[PDB]
Write a protein that binds this ligand. Structure first.
Ligand code: ZN
Ligand code: ZN
Lengths: 95, 95
């Protein structure tokens, strides 16, 4: 018994594609849906119609209705702060 | 276009396994090495001499020499923030 480990193993393998995370990267500062995400990040709407639903099913992502589309966003500040710090580890301004 | 992103899958290609990051969970409050990880997580020395070394050689981990010993750590507060923010979206309890 561990509580934490035995529930983020599910996160820390699902992270493993640069496309997936490049989207949450952006969401963590500004929200887009499948169709805007496809414009901003050069991805197909068919493809994001299945990557956004997967991110959602590992709970880094959340869907919501708004006016006359479904907006997508980060589930909560936890993993937005995980995902910020992977970029920070990968881009040192001075070594 | 990516600038850095595929160097960030290159730190996801450091995760993907259980005790590997159950170690680093604990390094995220106190620093421990091969013999003492193998004591404190009930592990084995053949094994930690491959996993402390992988993580070391994929920069989520850094050693420090103390004569015939080496103490070991996370690499910086970036990777310490990745694994502790994951260990925060795994459960969400009252405080
Ligand atoms: Zn760093
Ligand atoms: Zn959370």
């Amino acid at each position: 018994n561990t509580d934490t480990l035995e529930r983020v193993t599910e996160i820390f393998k699902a992270l493993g594609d640069y496309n997936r995370i490049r989207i949450m990267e952006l969401l963590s500062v500004s929200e887009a849906s499948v169709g805007h995400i496809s414009h901003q990040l050069n991805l197909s709407q068919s493809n994001v119609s299945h990557q956004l639903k997967l991110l959602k099913s590992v709970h880094l992502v959340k869907a919501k209705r708004q006016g006359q589309s479904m907006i997508y966003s980060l589930d909560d500040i936890h993993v937005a702060t995980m995902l910020k710090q992977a970029i920070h580890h990968a881009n040192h301004p001075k070594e």
